[PDB]
């Protein structure tokens, strides 16, 4: 009922934000709605937690240093069926829906796919009716807002809670104590932690709505406060110290920099949060401990919380003093293991001695582990010297490092990877000692994204298309959208999905050129690669490609070209030297592809500033074509990839992570797949990579670097570029120039269909009723099924 | 209406905690009854800032470093005429509203008097009708939560805020930038103060609902916020930096410390307030500026917001472009100073170079003030060297410092103490040259309470019986009170005062055997010392007299003795040695006093631990005998002396600060006025006052001197007191050996007259019936008519 709804809205206005309508600003409408919608949600938010209180079903608890939410208000609306509803009473009392909804500030607290993940597993989680929990830290500041300074990245610290955050409840009832430091003490009556210094961690509850069903669920993040208690005013300021834990999300993609403050941030977070759930355990209806893993699953996103593992056996041995072996056996049915990782410099490996100083319990119990691993190992293969050493949770060879993985792998009883290809090397190559001593332990479950916010809440043009032709039952199961096929006829549909995507990028540049001064050709191709920058990502290659566009234009003016916007978007590390220089030549080579008259309207290239997930929801649904160009072996799925091919983009991209698996659904040949596949790299290792002579042997590529090196794109600053050059021609692991001619063939092929609007359109057709297999949803149901040993309800 | 107050708690604790009544926690209902008696003066908050901006009344602005509001629960229901309506809510449902309220943290954002004083200043001009503001910081933390543990204070960190806050609004559109260092340049289009650092200042609103009226003012507090334009984590982390400067509350009760982060507390919560003030002036009906003193009126609290003298002249000087002349003008009508401030120790003095280093224009511009103020005085003065040295507002010396009452003096057209007697000497002793300049500038306005939260609120028995004897009017008119004359001879109306404070004694009675292990004798008297422990106030000198007491009682344990319950309170400064040694004191002599076998009932000793605003209100109106003993000269009024008057105890004190004031009213014998006078003290200072010879003279005294030096009240240790000892003899500014003869003399007559109930409490009678002076309503009517120029409304 709308008067409910503008009635509720008013009387938040009024008693909560303390304004009438002369006074109120966007921000107070924003949050008189936000409360408005909040109040719908709890009834059931209430009901969920008692339900799930009543019944005991086994619980599922999502452990992730990252939870990349976006914007919730109307995310939340529409799950609760309520959009409508609140657009209509919006509406009628004078208001702007879109202006209300733009205040919100993203819940920025991941860094990209891995934490954008969790997001999508917990809408769906939710959705399928699972009891699902999501943990992590509630961060003072998300991923850094990203803006471009004379063509460079410059980072501004990412406020999200300055103003207040409707959207979460503070559970001071459960705060906790964690433990840092100190020392062990081996005793008459056992092994004891002391000395320590302690760290508070209050959690606070956001809602976590099912599509259209009863459920409520909840993400609880965790916030760290110095305890209570304890030069007087130099000692009240050092209590920020303590809370300097949660203070600021690490901003690195697939890159592990080993930080006390961030295993600090791993510790907090496995040791609340293991905690609360043992709490919950025995509160429940349910040797005390034995019923322990049939009433919990910890899911464990990748290594960051690989203490979880010792933290368990802290817990079962040192505080409930069960027997090692006991324990053992309920860790290892407790905790799965999702590998994501693939990339050597992204694996965690930290210092024992910064694992002692910090936490010397649990070195104790990561030894001791390594010790009964090793033995059993010992007794298997008794002179296998080398699987030793391949197989133990310490690296030896100078430092000393505890390999992270290795420990999640022995205290797990099922290890995943995130797409086939990923899951298969993860297996049969990278852990191989570990999956010949047990092969059904290793997974594969094949990533997936929300068709709640990745299409109905981000394109309601395309999602309103399908739900004409084919209803509405397609948003709780995606497979259905292979009925979309019964219109590979119909020319009026072909120009209803190509009237969709129009409007889409009608609205993307009324965005696009209030914020950028270039001009869209609003006919030409929007071909986008929107991703954090890193070097296995080759916005590079995408580069080289436009550059290599710009150099026919201008030695043929005349001749026909398929006019394109480019678009590349995406945040690099802070620390992030080659990335930042990416950005930098993207930004350069826009500015001069962008004011040369004898190109013009033909091709414009835009840096698009702070990718984020809000801004996916704008950009995403306008794209033509999708680049997903990672070397092979490199993308363990991708989801981006999953996001425009839901959205009618077709994709440009190597046979790499969920590429393989999304051209398998939908017939390679509709899409524009290039390049070496992972055998290719492999034999390009092994005789060794020679960078020079694909620069020798190519006319294109060699202008293209010749300009780069020589200052054509810095002429100020002639070698700007040198380290880059550099790294292509002596230390590229990941072979632009090898895949620079099959790449720049492919574009070719896709500049001259998309000339054909029947033909482009009926392939854009295929893929997205092809989308089906990536809903969050399928994916989470396999988890359920083969890992939690949950089922879904309502 | 109850039945609408249970349906609003019942929404609140449903919507706003997201609870029913099976897992609520006494803090779910604390926060549900807070919401909804929030509620109930929305309205009204609206109503009258709508009100202040249509009519313009000339506003008041008081600005303060501190406000001691404590807590607001109780306070507001009160003001709002709702709390036997809730009490009967809150019991309908099952909870017990004492226990509600003890969940709410105090706001301890002073340090005792002056942060009092502001408090019951709001209270009074809210009552009154006039269009008041308070302005202040909002710290993160209070003044400490005092610990004794093992005969000592420690202290603890007052998280006041931790768990959220329901009584205050954030208030994001009036977010304001401060600067901080750069440096000064004088161009032809005025003085540009630049590359200065930022701090932002977000402000929150706090709500001062008048007794019983229309109006519901505002307390602004001010918080700190690091800029969003700024090793990237580290950068991060330095954001504390900034908002360090409303971390927490300086707890020096009456001394200056010259610390670098006061500084940026001053000129933050001035900056803020300033700019704030004048966007409202501008944006309301009326240079223009030649309005602003008709419209604004800024009370100074003592020096600590002197920096709003040049920041007022720099806005007008280097912003608006004011003239010199036109923009001091305005300043002086615009501002007025009130000094509470007596020991040399307490006053402000910043050195010139922490000033010229943060604060380079106040320092050009405080250096122009001086010069025209210095001109004024060679030219009435023609050969009187000296005088200028003593009016300058730089001391020249060594370090040259910048003396802030000179300060305060030239730039305000008003100045008063806070009682009669330190008003006189302020005006011609301490500042003579300036009053001998400017006669009319010196004012007196003697300090008041409010009977709200210190009658109505802690006292609801008196407040009752005194309401059934002759209405209600007197909260509104305390001067009233004085129809209490007539019943001096009605024996029933005696017996009724004696068994409200009967009562009141068992109620915290209660409280005392909960908290502290010790038996207390229901008829003994309750003899209370309460307040910030400080030399000057002489804690140690009552601390005598309970020595002095057991010992009578163990030479003679047959004799008759007066039973007592001595209770002493109070937070000491943390580097305050003496003070803390006092506290170590007064703890020792009592675990000696309340276990001694011999003793028993006759004599318990209680260290009333975290003395704060809500502990005040439980131990007031249980007090028979208030101790108000500092030497005479030393308190510049009190205040607590005050709140025991209203409430039915007798007084023993000195003929200091506003306890002079309190005998004119309710005549001198019916106080128990003891020791030196003012005249006395000039007297002993210029023969020299050799403590040696009280110590010689008085047998009593040299008992209990040796005793304590002796290691009589510290076995373990017969060395510890030596500190004590040492000053007594030879370092006491405020000679307790000379006032311990007539002050021991002077208990021995409170001991005769309380066995005399009759004539105990016609005496008490004539105290409470002669209190009506007291009430800051009394106060702010004359600040109102002959500072501020503004009138009470309704
Ligand atoms: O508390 C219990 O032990 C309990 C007992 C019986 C049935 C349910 C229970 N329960 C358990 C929780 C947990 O284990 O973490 C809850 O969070 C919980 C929360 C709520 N409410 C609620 C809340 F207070 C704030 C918020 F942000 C979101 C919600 Cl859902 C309720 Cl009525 C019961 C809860
Ligand atoms: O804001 C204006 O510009 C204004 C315009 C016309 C009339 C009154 C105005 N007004 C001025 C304020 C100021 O100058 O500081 C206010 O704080 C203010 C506050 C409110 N409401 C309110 C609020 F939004 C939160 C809160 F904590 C407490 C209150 Cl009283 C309102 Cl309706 C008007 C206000
Ligand atoms: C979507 O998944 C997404 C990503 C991940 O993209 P890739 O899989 O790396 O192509 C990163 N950032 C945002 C905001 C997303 O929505
Ligand atoms: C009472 O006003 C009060 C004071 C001031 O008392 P004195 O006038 O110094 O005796 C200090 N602290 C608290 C909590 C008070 O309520
Ligand atoms: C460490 C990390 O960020 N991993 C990322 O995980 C997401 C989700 O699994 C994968 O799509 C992506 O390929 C992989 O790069
Ligand atoms: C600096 C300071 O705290 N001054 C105090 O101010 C209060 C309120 O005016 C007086 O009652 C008190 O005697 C005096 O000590």
Redesign the interface.
């Known amino acids: 009922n709308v008067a409910e709804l503008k009635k509720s809205f008013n009387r938040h206005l009024?008693?909560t934000?303390?304004?009438?309508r002369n006074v109120a600003?966007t921000?107070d409408y924003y949050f008189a709605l936000a409360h408005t919608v909040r109040?719908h949600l709890?009834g059931r938010?209430?009901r969920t937690q008692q339900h799930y209180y009543d019944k005991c079903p086994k619980r599922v608890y999502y452990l992730s240093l990252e939870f990349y939410m976006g914007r919730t208000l109307q995310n939340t609306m529409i799950n609760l069926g309520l959009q409508n509803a609140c657009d209509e009473a919006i509406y009628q009392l004078g208001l702007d829906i879109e202006e209300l909804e733009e205040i919100e500030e993203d819940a920025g607290l991941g860094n990209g796919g891995l934490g954008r993940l969790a997001a999508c597993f917990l809408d769906s989680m939710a959705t399928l009716g699972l009891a699902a929990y999501g943990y992590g830290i509630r961060y003072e500041?998300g991923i850094?807002?990203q803006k471009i300074r004379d063509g460079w990245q410059v980072?501004?610290?990412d406020?999200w809670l300055?103003?207040?955050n409707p959207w979460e409840?503070?559970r001071?009832?459960f705060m906790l104590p964690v433990h840092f430091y100190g020392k062990v003490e081996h005793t008459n009556t056992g092994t004891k932690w002391i000395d320590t210094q302690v760290v508070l961690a209050?959690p606070y509850?956001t809602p976590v709505p099912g599509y259209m069903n009863n459920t409520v669920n909840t993400m609880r993040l965790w916030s760290a406060?110095?305890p209570?208690?304890?030069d007087?005013?130099q000692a009240?300021?050092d209590?920020?110290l303590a809370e300097?834990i949660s203070?600021?999300l690490?901003?690195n993609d697939n890159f592990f920099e080993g930080?006390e403050?961030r295993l600090k941030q791993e510790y907090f977070v496995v040791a609340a949060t293991l905690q609360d759930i043992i709490r919950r355990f025995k509160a429940s209806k349910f040797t005390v401990f034995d019923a322990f893993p049939d009433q919990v699953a910890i899911q464990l996103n990748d290594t960051h919380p690989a203490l979880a593992i010792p933290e368990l056996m802290r817990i079962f041995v040192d505080i409930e003093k069960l027997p090692w072996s006991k324990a053992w056996e309920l860790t290892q049915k407790t905790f799965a293991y999702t590998n994501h990782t693939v990339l050597p410099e992204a694996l965690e490996r930290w210092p024992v001695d910064l694992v002692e100083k910090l936490l010397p319990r649990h070195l104790e119990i990561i030894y001791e582990i390594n010790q009964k691993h090793l033995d059993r190992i010992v007794a298997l293969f008794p002179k296998d010297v080398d699987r030793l050493r391949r197989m133990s949770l310490i690296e030896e060879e100078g430092s000393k490092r505890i390999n992270m993985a290795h420990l999640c792998i022995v205290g797990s009883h099922a290890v995943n990877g995130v797409a086939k290809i990923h899951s298969d090397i993860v297996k049969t190559k990278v852990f191989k000692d570990f999956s010949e001593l047990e092969p059904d332990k290793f997974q594969n479950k094949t990533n997936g994204i929300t068709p709640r916010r990745w299409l109905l809440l981000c394109n309601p043009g395309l999602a309103e298309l399908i739900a004409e032709k084919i209803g509405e039952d397609y948003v709780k199961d995606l497979s259905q959208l292979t009925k979309l096929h019964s219109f590979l006829g119909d020319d009026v549909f072909l120009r209803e999905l190509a009237k969709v995507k129009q409007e889409n990028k009608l609205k993307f540049s009324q965005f696009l050129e209030t914020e950028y001064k270039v001009k869209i050709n609003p006919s030409s191709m929007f071909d986008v690669q929107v991703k954090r920058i890193h070097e296995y990502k080759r916005q590079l290659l995408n580069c080289l490609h436009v550059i290599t566009m710009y150099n026919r234009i201008k030695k043929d003016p005349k001749k026909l070209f398929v006019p394109r916007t480019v678009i590349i978007g995406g945040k690099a590390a802070?620390?992030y030297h080659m990335a930042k220089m990416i950005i930098k030549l993207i930004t350069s080579v826009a500015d001069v592809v962008n004011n040369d008259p004898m190109v013009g309207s033909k091709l414009k290239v835009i840096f698009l500033e702070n990718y984020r997930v809000s801004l996916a929801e704008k950009v995403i649904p306008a794209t033509d074509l999708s680049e997903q160009i990672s070397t092979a072996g490199t993308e363990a799925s991708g989801t981006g990839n999953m996001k425009f091919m839901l959205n009618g983009a077709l994709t440009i991209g190597t046979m790499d992570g969920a590429n393989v698996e999304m051209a398998e659904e939908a017939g390679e040949e509709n899409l524009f797949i290039f390049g070496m596949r992972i055998d290719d790299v492999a034999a390009l290792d092994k005789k060794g990579y020679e960078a020079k002579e694909y620069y020798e042997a190519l006319p294109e590529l060699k202008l293209v670097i010749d300009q780069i090196d020589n200052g054509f794109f810095s002429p100020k600053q002639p070698d700007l570029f040198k380290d880059i050059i550099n790294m292509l021609f002596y230390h590229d692991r990941f072979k632009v120039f090898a895949d620079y001619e099959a790449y720049v063939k492919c574009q070719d092929k896709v500049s001259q269909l998309y000339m054909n609007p029947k033909a482009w359109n009926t392939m854009v057709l295929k893929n997205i009723a092809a989308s089906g297999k990536f809903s969050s949803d399928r994916t989470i149901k396999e988890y359920a099924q083969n890992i939690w040993n949950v089922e879904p309800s309502d």
Chains 1, 2 share one sequence.
Not at 17 to 20: E, R
């Open positions: 009024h008693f934000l303390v304004k009438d600003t921000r109040d709890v938010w209430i500041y850094f807002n980072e501004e610290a406020d300055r103003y207040g409840k503070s001071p009832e209050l509850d406060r110095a209570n208690d304890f007087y005013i009240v300021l209590r920020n300097n203070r600021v690490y901003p930080k403050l802070p620390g």
